[PDB]
Design a protein around this ligand. Structure first.
Ligand SMILES: *[C@@H]1O[C@H](CO)[C@@H](O)[C@H](O)[C@H]1NC(C)=O
Ligand SMILES: [Ca+2]
Length: 270
């Protein structure tokens, strides 16, 4: 009933469909300054406090630039977000899983460095992952291999075998793009959703009439996907149950019965 991780005002649909109440800054993380991952783009609230840490991976030949929406939209709702670049454009999901792990390790280190823009902004104990395509698989692999992680949002996950995810205990929200021809939802995203233990808080939202890149910068679903992603991270990274209506109740139903959505699965309520 006391939630120490609680931040921002009581959520409204309209507030969650746009940049949040937290002023943010971004800096880049040079490839040369890190091993474990290929650098990337760091977004953080300027307000004093410690926030959940979120690492986001692009997919095959993907760059951090294509997911800056996720950096800005999540950070502005009260998170520290690192959208990574990979060691190589050709890294497979198991590799993207290690890099997400290492990027989260990096944020924890920088959190103790008085020179860092994120000095004392990172709650080391509250970590989440997300990613596009092979980055989505990577995010679910990292969540499997780091069960202390609070949340995973695989977005249009590629074809890591759904078998690999039968022991995921980390609350997982999967985005699908209905007319994805690169990672068809019916053979890729949906079997992964179904492979996750039913005791694991989970959710699948499928964007109607859109392709593999419907979740990326300019995909055309900033309002709805952002609102779902913010709500998933708030719910599980911040244990903020004010966000339940947006993933399980009235405001989720609004979204998931809307023309924008072609499929919806979940083990609600939570
Ligand atoms: C998991 O839940 C699904 C969806 O309701 C159900 O089909 C399946 O039997 C459940 N799995 C187990 C192991 O009970
Ligand atoms: Ca689109």
């Amino acid at each position: 009933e006391f939630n120490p991780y609680q931040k921002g005002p009581d959520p409204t649909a309209s507030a969650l469909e746009r940049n949040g109440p937290f002023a943010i800054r971004s800096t880049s993380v040079s490839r040369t300054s890190v091993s474990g991952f290929g650098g990337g783009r760091l977004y953080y609230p300027t307000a004093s406090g410690t926030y959940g840490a979120i690492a986001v991976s692009p997919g095959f030949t993907g760059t951090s630039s294509t997911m800056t929406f996720w950096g800005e939209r999540l950070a502005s709702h009260g998170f520290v977000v690192l959208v990574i670049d990979t060691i190589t454009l050709y890294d497979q999901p198991d590799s993207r899983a290690r890099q997400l792990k290492a990027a989260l390790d990096y944020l924890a280190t920088q959190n103790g460095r008085s020179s860092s823009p994120i000095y004392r902004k990172v709650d080391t104990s509250r970590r989440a992952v997300a990613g596009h395509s092979m980055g989505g698989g990577g995010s679910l692999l990292a969540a499997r291999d780091n069960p202390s992680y609070k949340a995973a949002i695989p977005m249009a996950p590629w074809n890591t075998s759904s078998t690999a995810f039968r022991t995921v205990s980390v609350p997982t929200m999967i985005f699908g793009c209905q007319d994805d021809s690169i990672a068809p939802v019916f053979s890729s995203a949906i079997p992964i959703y179904n492979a996750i233990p039913n005791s694991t808080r989970k959710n699948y939202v499928e964007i109607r009439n859109d392709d593999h890149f419907c979740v990326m910068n300019g995909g055309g679903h900033d309002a709805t996907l952002g609102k779902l992603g913010i709500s998933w991270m708030k719910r599980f990274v911040d244990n903020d149950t004010r966000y339940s209506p947006f993933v399980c109740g009235a405001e989720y139903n609004r979204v998931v019965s809307s023309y924008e959505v072609s499929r919806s699965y979940n083990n609600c309520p939570y």
